[model samples]
Target chain A: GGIEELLRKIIEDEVRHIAELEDIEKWLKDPVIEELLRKIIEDEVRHIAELEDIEKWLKDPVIEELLRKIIEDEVRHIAELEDIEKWLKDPVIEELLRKIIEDEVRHIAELEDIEKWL
Target chain B: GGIEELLRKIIEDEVRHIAELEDIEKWLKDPVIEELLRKIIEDEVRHIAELEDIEKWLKDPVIEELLRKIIEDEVRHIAELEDIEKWLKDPVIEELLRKIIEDEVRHIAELEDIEKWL
Candidate 1:
């Protein structure tokens, strides 16, 4: 109930924006640029899904509690990944681990938000 | 070699952006808005991890081929989710399924891009 409708509207706008970008993608001259645009669109679409999940999470107390635990796990994962990153010598693998750590940190923040909102 | 450094720079910029937002979040009066900002930051962090995976994928032929099959599975998942959505009458469940479908579609597009780049 708390801003669920507001979030839904935003999701709808994102859907429309993705459709528009897909349409515009037809005119791009560079294949690489086109691919990048496609990736951006996909990421946007995924956001809509995640936002919807937030809306659902706001309604359920059980999910709210689950989200809290997920947040803790995410925090732990970030620390573990950071430790692993330090031991890896390959730049590529190190980079990948760093990215995962960054993601886990974000997940902690996001899951915390859901718990807070509930 | 192909645009890996370019993408890494972009990821670094995103990390900086998230850090800046976290700093700004401390001054916000509205908890709801602050929570929203936290979620966005988390999503951005997840994107960095995903982009890093793409960098790793680009370097390995095995990953590139695996990505192709993953894309196919994602496409199938979208269809399966849509079918499940039709059977669900509960608005909450329906909304969840729709969210998943959106994610799967995005996954398909993203995986396809990785395959193309490889």
Candidate 2:
């Protein structure tokens, strides 16, 4: 968590990118640009999720590549959550997090387990 | 905030259902089954996002329709966060949350403004 020293800068850049995207669409008022905005927002959110959360947050929960991105964070969280599960001294809180953790693991397993045939 | 007394039960059902999905895929071991799993996970995540977040969370940031789903929560959160924003006597912390809120609004405006042109 403390490792993300530049998170604020990164978030600032994302806000700027959203503004820029807004400008692009307003500049042309074109469907093509609209499509591009869609694609880019799609990518940017995915990028942000991956960059910020995949390693630390969820491994995670996402938006496409955002969904994929966040699911990866969720997956990463599984590992990271498992890591934290170690330090939890209280069984109740640990169980609470564990319940969430198990769901996440099952979510991944659901993804992979189905991959066998399809 | 205390409205969701059954949230735990809902979560438990979700876990059990994921196991059911897992079983169906394992039972058949077919591509069609695999494809179904893909579609279901896609739908389930999006569905969960909307059911939980759209009204209360963002209106939010999503995985959609999960991305759409969560952006909705982010949007809803904007409203909720703004509601809480009223109580923030601390200028510094208010500004901190404010920065995030502004970006979220920009994100919504980015989406809707483009809807007109395209």
Candidate 3:
């Protein structure tokens, strides 16, 4: 069931994972930043866990019946990130977000390890 | 060999992938999004390197041949990504890039496979 789609799926998952980090930096650096970067980071962590769970479920076809549930969650998650990014453009907020994003970048490197190991 | 379509290959691949969520599966699985998301992430890294390297390597004919070859694979991957993205977007050429992502996903799978067999 995973197929080439699986590879694409994992890559896309990591992309969001990485984007979540970048947004964290942006949110933290905001001056009037109405939001806290940590909040988003928390969401991202949740998303990552979701992805890990999904990764396991992928091997099982019976779970395909439950896929639509996860799909909706992803749609909602993407919208939430975009909504924030559109509003928070302050330099301070951006810098703070980037600082945290540096950590996320580190994670990106780590995820990439999967490619090397495989 | 994948045709190198420059940085546009990856970025366009992502844009198309993101656009797919509304359609594709209507409730496309999380794995699909994850795969597309990761494509953007890795490509961002690769884009930076490609830009820097091409700027320097452009002067050398020997490197150009190799560069073009690399570019070709990217192009091949881009074609595949475009194809998949388009499929998810609707059923037209509009979602072009993500469609090729299927190809890209396969390409990466090949990378992993090659890494494994090597």
Candidate 4:
């Protein structure tokens, strides 16, 4: 139990470190790498969303600003996917989008981004 | 729409495989790679004869030597694909000749080379 608590505490700090990386999205520079980074972060987003569930909107309210922030990050990932679609045919563009295809297993970790309850 | 999508997917795989071959051919001056390339060319021509032969040979001896030159290039292209297939499943020559379309795909990608349309 203590080890689980310790692990959770470390991970909560890791979440903040990830948040700091998101705050510096402007410097991420490489579009493909950023796409992968977005997919990875969407996992973190989903975790937060699941914890809040539909209650944030219809039941007991939870941390207000934190949910908004995570949802915004997910919207940002959608925008990046659109950005990729804009140049899907460019020769150099494939090289850019390639890492996303290559790292697809890791990107699947983004199922966290789709945690809304019906 | 699905047909167009399938066609596009096939062509996409074709082009990507071609790029892969070229990356391998950058090391092509090697003779073992050269020999495997020759074997691939011979097999395609032999298979073509078994089916409906192109007949370009008989109908247009107007430039016999020129045809040989073109065939030489075909060998070059096949050589690249053959060598590229070296580490992969095209393990033995017997197993290789069994998959004619795959061998042909290698030829197609090699045929395009790095033209402007690329």
Candidate 5:
């Protein structure tokens, strides 16, 4: 229920984004601008399909390589953020940054292990 | 674990989008268009923060009106789409439309009822 709810809500947001693109397209009549809006609309349309695919894949199984790509980036970001943290001097700010970075680490680990058999 | 994974994963997409925005900005240095990039970058920055808030609020909760407003729009779209289906002549296309509309209805119901505790 929770996953479906989130997916649907995400779809709602995508729909709103599509609507926003259409409205903005009205004002920017230049060729380049129209191309940009068209590209954005295509992305949103693709996103909706991807979101729906996520929903469908739950009943099946996810492709490991595809998920690994996502996991790889989350891994990279945590590394980069930690590298950034080395230059920070303040205790209070570093702790807060540490909080998020820690969360990001666990996020990657969780996906690495989510092997549900249902 | 799942929620946090999704949140961070969403953050990655936003960051990529910000990068994309910066690239597009470089090509379109026209005065009016520079203003447009400024606005888009501002929105992405705000989106990152809102997403971070969603992560934090899981330890707390979201405002009811905010969720309700989201629920409201999904409902309106379902209504409008159903009306549009009336004008469609093909049964096959209408069936596909009905499939998505049904999912949309359940999505609205799920959010209307997601009460949780930390």
Candidate 6:
């Protein structure tokens, strides 16, 4: 009973610690950070929507479902990178983002082709 | 004025669509889906915790921070893959997960080495 109590106490403490740390981190960051987190959350929500749409449309074609999921993730990554590109003033980071966005676009196209073949 | 109102209405409709789709999807899926989503959210929350910890401890060592971020993503991927692996009954999927987990572990080590060199 004592060990269980100790474990519960540790879990509660860690949860609170995590929450406070998140609050402090958000407070310290620029307004851009808030927008970035919002974008990420919205993208994930959109992903869930898209995944369910695929499931409804395709109805358990496992390979196609998986391919579409990969495509969705790539598309989301592109959106995220493009958003970052808008905010980035550094040329180096901008170039890196460009390359990544290009790669993700390519990946999406490739995955789509695979889905078509399947 | 008409165009703006139409655009606003479309946005609101899409938002509702996403929310309803998500609710339906969760209701249709097995309870395992709920656990998987919870694990993912907690993993993400933990990632934010770890990233903030790095920021506090390192105080803007750009490369190390970036490498640590990569490592965190890789670690999260491993956790996600392992979760999927547990749910997967198909040998093929399990093997694929194995290969992916191995690759991610390797990538994490490589990134850490690069960080050390930097």
- Top candidate on TM-score is 2
Clashing pairs in 6: none
For residues A3-43, write the lDDT of model 4, one tens digit per residue: 33533443353355345435434444667756655564544
**Candidate 4: clashing pairs of residues:** A46-A112
- Give TM-scores of the second chain, every candidate: 0.50, 0.38, 0.37, 0.31, 0.48, 0.49
lDDT of 3 by residue, A1-118 (tens): 5334554454355446545555555546654432443334333433343344444333433233333333444344445545555666566554544444444444444434433333
* Fraction of the reference Cα-Cα interface contacts (below 8 Å) that each candidate reproduces: 0.00, 0.00, 0.00, 0.00, 0.00, 0.00
Q: DockQ for all models, in order?
A: 0.03, 0.03, 0.02, 0.01, 0.02, 0.02
**Backbone N/Cα/C clashes per model:** 0, 42, 52, 1, 0, 0
Q: Higher-TM-score candidate among 2 and 3? A: 2
List residue ranges in candidate 5 displaced over 4 A: A1-57, A60-90, A112-118, B1-61, B76-80, B83-88, B92-118
Instruction: Provide the lDDT at A68 for model 5.
Output: 54
Angstrom error of the Cα, residue A10, model 5: value is 21
| Interface root mean square deviation per prediction | 10.4, 6.6, 16.4, 29.4, 13.8, 13.1
Cand 6, B chain, TM: 0.49
After superposition, which runs of candidate 1 have C-alpha atoms over 4 Å from their true positions? A1-118, B1-54
Model 4, docking class: incorrect
Error of 1 at A90 (Å): 31
Local distance difference test scores for all models = 0.52, 0.46, 0.43, 0.40, 0.49, 0.49
What is candidate 3's lDDT per residue for B1-118, written digit by digit as tens? 3434523454354434434432443355657655654454333333333333343333322233333433455555566456456556445534444444564564444334322422
lDDT for each residue of candidate 2 in A48-115, tens digit (9 for 90 to 100)? 43344323223222223333544465466567546655754657545654765665565456434422
Q: How do the predictions measure up, each by TM-score?
A: 0.29, 0.34, 0.27, 0.20, 0.29, 0.30
Deviation of model 1 at B57, angstroms: 4.1
lDDT of 1 by residue, B1-118 (tens): 5456655664565455456545545544447645655554554444444455554333433344345544555565556547656754558656755764565565566446546756
Off by over 4 Å in 3: A1-12, A15-43, A50-66, A90-118, B1-118
